[PDB]
Amino acid sequence: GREEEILERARELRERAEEAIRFLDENADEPWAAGPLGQMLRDIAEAIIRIAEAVELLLEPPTEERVERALELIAEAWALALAAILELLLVKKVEVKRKQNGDDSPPTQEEIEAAREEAEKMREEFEKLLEEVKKEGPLTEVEHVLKLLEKFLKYLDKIIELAEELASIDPDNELAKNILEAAKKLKELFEKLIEELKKSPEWLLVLAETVLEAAETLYDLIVKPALEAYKA
């Protein structure tokens, strides 16, 4: 059962992300979990939880109300994840540049807030796109979803470019390599998805399957490795 199978992936993905958040809380006293890196991993893990919960709405009896609310939750959750990934790159860029120059001291609060505010602007611009597309019509129309996915592709290009430059500044930085590899995979997944939605009669399931795979990629390549690096 394709739909039974999607519901199973969503619940398993949800449980893995919750284990991640429990890991960060049980380690709240440690400095890395309190800092910006830990909070961004939490945000990504929370975004994965929300994506999984929203997919479960899709796999219900179809209705204009639930499906559209489900599409907005998927869109806003990916908006959170891409913004958290962006802020993570921005904070690590400042960390690496400083520690290379010297000043082992952690990045200043102003540097951190500057990165948080840039990520936040990306999150707000997506919300404005969502609100304007919705007045044009419901997101249950394929063209409207494609408009949101193309915007995700734009943000993902920005992440890729920025992760490329961290990897040039710090060639041996595993977090930058993982974000770069995850961002490249998400771009391939979302481009193939834009191709398919036009010709797919059951496009909600195709969208459901793709966002689960994309969220699984965030968990497997970004979240879980960074946590395991701190256990050891």
Side-chain angles (χ1 to χ4, degrees), residues 118-134:
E118 179 174 355
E120 176 65 26
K121 184 174 182 178
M122 176 180 281
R123 192 173 177 183
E124 292 190 357
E125 297 178 359
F126 185 80
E127 306 303 335
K128 299 178 178 68
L129 179 67
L130 185 65
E131 295 177 356
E132 75 179 9
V133 172
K134 189 177 179 181

Side-chain angles (χ1 to χ4, degrees), residues 77-210:
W78 276 103
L80 175 59
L82 299 177
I85 289 160
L86 183 66
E87 180 178 355
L88 198 58
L89 290 176
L90 290 172
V91 173
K92 286 296 287 290
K93 179 180 177 181
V94 176
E95 291 184 355
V96 174
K97 293 181 80 72
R98 299 175 84 255
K99 309 306 174 286
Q100 285 178 353
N101 293 318
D103 201 3
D104 176 72
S105 66
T108 69
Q109 297 311 113
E110 178 177 358
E111 289 169 348
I112 296 166
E113 272 289 326
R116 189 183 63 78
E117 293 175 352
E118 179 174 355
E120 176 65 26
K121 184 174 182 178
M122 176 180 281
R123 192 173 177 183
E124 292 190 357
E125 297 178 359
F126 185 80
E127 306 303 335
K128 299 178 178 68
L129 179 67
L130 185 65
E131 295 177 356
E132 75 179 9
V133 172
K134 189 177 179 181
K135 288 185 180 179
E136 183 182 4
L139 286 176
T140 63
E141 294 180 353
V142 170
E143 66 174 358
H144 289 166
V145 171
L146 291 178
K147 296 182 181 181
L148 302 179
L149 292 173
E150 293 170 353
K151 174 69 81 171
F152 289 158
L153 290 180
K154 292 183 182 181
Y155 293 166
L156 216 55
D157 291 334
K158 181 180 182 181
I159 285 163
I160 289 176
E161 298 169 354
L162 205 158
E164 289 286 337
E165 74 172 2
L166 263 182
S168 70
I169 299 165
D170 190 359
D172 297 327
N173 189 358
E174 292 176 354
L175 178 63
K177 294 167 186 164
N178 288 327
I179 287 166
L180 181 64
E181 171 58 27
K184 284 178 184 178
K185 181 68 175 176
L186 299 194
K187 185 181 178 181
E188 182 185 5
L189 292 170
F190 285 158
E191 286 177 341
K192 191 173 181 180
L193 185 57
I194 290 170
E195 176 185 0
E196 287 182 349
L197 291 177
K198 303 174 185 178
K199 65 182 181 181
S200 177
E202 306 183 0
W203 65 272
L204 286 171
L205 272 64
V206 180
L207 179 63
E209 285 173 353
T210 291

